[PDB]
Amino acid sequence: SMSYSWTGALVTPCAAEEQKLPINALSNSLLRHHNLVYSTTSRSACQRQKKVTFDRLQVLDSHYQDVLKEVKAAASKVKANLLSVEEACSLTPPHSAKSKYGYGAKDVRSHASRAVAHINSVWKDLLEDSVTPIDTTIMAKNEVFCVQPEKGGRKPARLIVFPDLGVRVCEKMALYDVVSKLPLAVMGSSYGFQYSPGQRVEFLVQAWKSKKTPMGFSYDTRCFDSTVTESDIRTEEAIYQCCDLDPQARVAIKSLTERLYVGGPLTNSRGENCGYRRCRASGVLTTSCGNTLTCYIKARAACRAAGLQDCTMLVCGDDLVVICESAGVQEDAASLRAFTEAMTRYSAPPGDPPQPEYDLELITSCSSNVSVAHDGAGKRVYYLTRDPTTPLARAAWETARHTPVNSWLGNIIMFAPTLWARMILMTHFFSVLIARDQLEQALDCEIYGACYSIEPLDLPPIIQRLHGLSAFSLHSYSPGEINRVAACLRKLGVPPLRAWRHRARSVRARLLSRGGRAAICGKYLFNWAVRTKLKLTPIAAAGQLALSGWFTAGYSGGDIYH
C-alpha cells in the first residue's frame, strides 16, 4: 500500500516561521555568514511529502521469520508495568504541544482537573474501542541548517505526525516501561541507546579489534519511516505482547496499535484533512523502539541472506552499522550488494548504496565518526566527532532567539571531547551565559530524544561521567579533523580557533573568580586555553551523580521529559 495518501490540503504552520538567521550581535560573534543559515518551514512541506510517498512491496522469507522467532523469545523474558496517570503526566515536557480539548502541558504536569479528566476518558475509550482510527496532527519541523548550494541547496522540512496530548499521556501509561526495557532485552549489545558516548567508542573499537580482518559499513535506508509497513507495525505489537503485561496494558497496546500506530488520518494546524498514513508515525512513543526493532530484525535477517561472517551490529532507530569478518574485497562487495537486495525485499532500500570500509574512522553513522586524539601522557584516545556545521548553525540561531530546547547544550555534552565543542561552543555559550546573567539557570536539552533539564554549571561532572577525565586534556587532534573544522569556520564566517582561545582565557578568568561550580567549569573546561596548566583530578561531584536513566533508551519523537 501507499505510505501516504494526500487530499491536496497543505501542511500549515501554527505560528510565524522565520526563514533566515536573525541578525544579533551575540549570535554574529559566533557566526557572521548569516545568509547561509536557514530554518526549514512549512513552505517546503510539499517537497518532503513527495519524497516520503510511495508504494511498499514487502516480501518476507525464512531468515526474517527465524530472527522474528528469536526476538519474540527474547521479549518473553521481559516484565513490564503500567504507569499511573500521575507518573505518565510527570514524563510530559513543559513545552509539549497543548491539547485540542482545552488544556496544555503545564496543566498535565500539575495534574489539573480538566487535563486528568480528558486523559481518563481517552484511556477508557482505548479499553472500549479497538478499531476507530485516532486523529493525528501533521506539522513541518522547524530545523536549522547551513545551505549547501553545490549539493541541492536547501533541505525540505521533515514532517512530524503526532496524536493529541491526551493520547500521548495514555501511550506512556501503556508502553513507557515496554519501550524502556524491551530493546535491550531483545538486542543486547546491538542496542545503541544503552551506551554513553564513551561506552559507544569502547564498544566500536573492541568490535573492530575482535575481527581478524574487519570490514564495516553503514546502511542508510531511504525514508525509513515510510518503509515501515502495516505488517511491520502489527509485528511490533506482537513482540510487545510477548512481555508479561497487565491485562489492561494488553488491551491498550492493541488499541493503540490498530487505531494509531498502524495508520490514521492526518490533520493540519487549521483542522483540515490532509490525508491518510499507512506507515510509521514520527511523533509517537514507540517511534524509536519500533524503528530500532524493525531495523534490527530486517538487518539481522539480511546479514544471513548476504552471507556476512561473524557480524557485530549496532542499531539506533533507522541508523545501522555492521562490523564483520572480511571475506576478501570482491567477496565483501558482492555480499554487501546481497545485503541491500535482502533489505530491499524487506521494504527498506537505501538512499545511497552502502560501501564496504576497512578503516574504522571511515564509517559514518548518526552523522558521526570515530577519530583519535592524545591525552596528557601521550596515550591515544578515541572519541566520536562530527562535522560541526549544523551544530554551529543551530548554536547561532539559539543565541539570537530563545528556543524551548537548546541543541547547543546537548552538543556540548555529547561531543565534549571534540576540538570544536571545546574551543568554540563552550567558550561561546559560557561567554553568552555570563553576559546575560543566565549562568545559574537550568536549560532544556535533548539526549537521545529525551528532554532533560540541565544546569550548565554541572557540565564538568557530566562530561567526566560520559567521556572520562581525558576529555579535558585532549590534544594533538588528527589532521583530517583539524582540516574539517577549519573548512567549516571559513564557510560559516566563524572566528579562527586562536581568537576563541583568547576569548576563552577571559571567560576562564571570570569563571574562576566566581568560585564554586563556576570555578570548576573554568578549571576543567578551559584548561586547554592556558599554558600554565592546572592539575585535573577526578571531580567529586561526578561520583555523586545519578545518570543511569540517561542511557537506558532512545525516545526521539516520544514526547519524553526526565
Ligand SMILES: CNC(=O)c1c(-c2ccc(F)cc2)oc2cc(N(Cc3ccc(B(O)O)c(F)c3)S(C)(=O)=O)c(C3CC3)cc12
Ligand atoms: C548505529 N550508529 C551508532 O550507534 C552511532 C555511531 C557510529 C559512528 C561510526 C561507526 F563506525 C559506528 C557507529 O556514532 C554515534 C554517535 C551518537 N551520538 C550523537 C548523536 C547522534 C544522533 C542523535 B539523534 O538524532 O538520534 C543523538 F541523539 C546523538 S553520541 C556522540 O554518542 O552522543 C549516537 C547517538 C545514540 C544516537 C549514535 C552513534
